[PDB]
Design an enzyme around this catalytic site. Structure first.
Site, short mmCIF file in Angstrom:
data_model
loop_
_atom_site.label_atom_id
_atom_site.label_comp_id
_atom_site.label_asym_id
_atom_site.label_seq_id
_atom_site.Cartn_x
_atom_site.Cartn_y
_atom_site.Cartn_z
N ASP B 6 0.85 -1.18 0.00
CA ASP B 6 0.00 0.00 0.00
C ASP B 6 0.89 1.24 0.00
OD1 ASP B 6 -2.33 1.68 0.33
OD2 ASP B 6 -2.06 1.62 2.55
N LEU B 7 0.34 2.39 -0.37
CA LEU B 7 1.15 3.59 -0.48
C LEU B 7 0.94 4.44 0.77
CD1 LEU B 7 3.13 4.99 -2.04
CD2 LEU B 7 1.50 5.49 -3.85
N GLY B 8 -0.30 4.87 0.98
CA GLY B 8 -0.63 5.77 2.07
C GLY B 8 -0.53 5.09 3.44
N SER B 107 -2.45 0.70 -4.86
CA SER B 107 -2.94 1.92 -4.25
C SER B 107 -4.32 2.30 -4.77
CB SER B 107 -1.98 3.04 -4.47
OG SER B 107 -2.38 4.16 -3.72
N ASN B 108 -5.24 2.46 -3.82
CA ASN B 108 -6.45 3.25 -4.00
C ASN B 108 -6.08 4.74 -4.00
OD1 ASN B 108 -7.86 0.85 -3.95
ND2 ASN B 108 -9.09 1.36 -2.13
N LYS B 141 -9.28 -1.60 -3.76
CA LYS B 141 -9.26 -2.38 -2.53
C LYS B 141 -10.46 -1.97 -1.67
CE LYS B 141 -5.23 -0.74 -1.44
NZ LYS B 141 -3.83 -0.41 -1.06
N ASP B 166 -2.27 -0.49 5.92
CA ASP B 166 -2.64 0.05 7.22
C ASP B 166 -4.14 -0.03 7.46
OD1 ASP B 166 -2.62 2.37 5.16
OD2 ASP B 166 -3.63 3.34 6.84
MG MG Z 1 -3.00 3.22 3.37
#
Ligand code: MG
Ligand code: CA
Ligand code: CA
Ligand code: MG
EC number: 3.1.3.10
Lengths: 199, 202
Positions: B6-8, B107-108, B141, B166
Site C-alpha cells: 500500500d502507499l498511504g 494503491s487506491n 481495494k 494500514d
Molecule cells: Mg493506506
C-alpha cells in the site's frame, strides 16, 4: 527574554524540491533542468519585501526557468512545498511563554495570496506571541532594519534577545546588532539549547 | 516472493488535514466544520475506480462540504496534502528487488489529472517493479478483483504473496484470498517484519 524563531528549517522542515517535482509533473520539464535553473535572485528578495506582486514574481521565476505555466498553475505547484512541523519546537515555544518569556516568529516568506503557507498554520500561530513577516514589513533578513523592527516593537534590547536561524547570513545580520544568535544546524540545536534554559 | 505495498501510511505518511487547512484558508470556512463534513463515501469509491471525472468528484465533495471552490481551487488545495517519504520502507523495497523478489505498489488513489501525487514521485516509481493504481484498473481495494489482478498480472499464488496495508478492511479482502496480509499499525511494523525474515536464514 525575547526569543525570535525563524520558520523554515527551524520550526518546520520545508523542501522546495517538491515544488520542482510538481512543476515537472505538469510541464514534463526534466527535474534536473528545474534544479539547475531555480535560483534565489532579486525577484525573490523583492517578493519577500512585498515590493512586487505574486504575479510579477511568478513571471520572473517562469522566465528564469522557462515554465509555460499560468499564474494559477504556478501557484498550484508552489502549494506542494513539503512542510512538516517540528513538534519539539512548537512545545518549547509554548513552554517559554507560559514561563513568561516572549516568543515571536521572524520569517522571510514567499507566500502568495492564493497559497496556504506555514505562518498561517494554526499550530504555528498559537505557539507564537507575534509573527513578523517580510512581505508585511517591506523588509527581509538579513537587513538590520527587520531585526531592529522586532526589537523596537517588542521592547527588548539586543543583549536580552536570542535568535534562531538555520541561515548563516541571517545569523550574521542579527550579530551585527549584538543580538544573541544561534545557528540552527539540525533538529537537536534548539532542544539542546533549551534543556538547561527551561531548567 | 511477491511483495505488495500500500502507499498511504505505509510507504509515505499522508495527512488530508493539510488539504482541509488549505481550503479553510481560501474559503474562510472554520476547519472544524470541514473536519465534520469530510467523509470517504460513494463519490470517493467511484473516483478511486476512475468511474467519475476529477471535476465530478470535486463537485461531489464541494456539494457535501458546502465549499464555494472552482475545480482549480479544489485541486489547488488537494495538492497541499501532507506527504512524507518513509525512507526505511523505500530502502527495504530496493533491497528486496536486488535480492530478486518482486516488489509492487497497490494503491487506491484520488489523484487528479492536475495534481502531483505520491505514486508519481520518482523515489517511489524507482523503488517498485510496478505500481498498480485503482483509477487505471477500474477497481479498488478491498474488492477481490484488484488483488486477483495483481496475482494474475505478476503470476504468483496467494501463498507466495505478502501484502502490507494500514487499513484493516484492505487486509481482510486480501486474507479472503489466502494472501499473507500484514496490518501496518505504525512505522515499525515493516522494519520489524523484515528483521525477522533476515534473522531466518541459518
Ligand atoms: Mg493506506
Ligand atoms: Ca493563505
Ligand atoms: Ca500528475
Ligand atoms: Mg530558515
Amino acid at each position: 527574554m525575547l526569543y525570535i524563531f525563524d520558520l523554515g528549517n527551524v520550526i518546520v522542515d520545508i523542501d522546495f524540491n517538491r515544488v520542482l517535482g510538481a512543476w515537472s509533473d505538469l510541464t514534463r520539464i526534466p527535474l534536473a533542468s528545474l534544479k539547475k535553473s531555480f535560483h534565489m535572485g532579486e525577484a525573490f528578495h523583492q517578493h519577500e519585501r512585498g515590493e512586487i506582486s505574486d504575479e510579477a514574481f511568478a513571471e520572473a521565476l517562469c522566465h528564469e526557468m522557462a515554465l509555460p505555466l499560468s499564474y494559477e498553475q504556478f501557484s498550484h505547484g508552489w502549494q506542494a512545498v513539503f512542510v512538516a512541523l517540528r513538534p519539539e519546537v512548537i512545545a518549547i515555544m509554548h513552554k517559554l511563554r507560559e514561563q513568561g518569556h516572549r516568543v515571536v516568529v521572524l520569517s522571510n516568506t514567499n507566500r502568495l495570496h492564493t497559497t496556504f503557507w506555514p505562518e498561517e498554520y494554526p499550530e504555528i500561530r498559537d505557539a507564537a506571541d507575534h509573527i513578523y513577516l517580510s512581505q508585511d514589513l517591506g523588509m527581509r533578513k538579513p537587513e538590520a532594519r527587520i531585526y531592529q523592527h522586532v526589537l523596537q516593537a517588542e521592547g527588548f534590547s539586543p543583549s536580552d534577545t536570542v535568535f534562531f536561524d538555520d541561515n548563516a547570513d541571517n545569523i550574521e545580520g542579527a550579530n551585527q546588532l549584538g543580538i544573541t544568535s544561534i545557528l540552527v544546524k539540525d533538529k537537536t540545536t534548539i532542544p539542546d539549547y533549551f534543556a538547561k534554559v527551561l531548567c
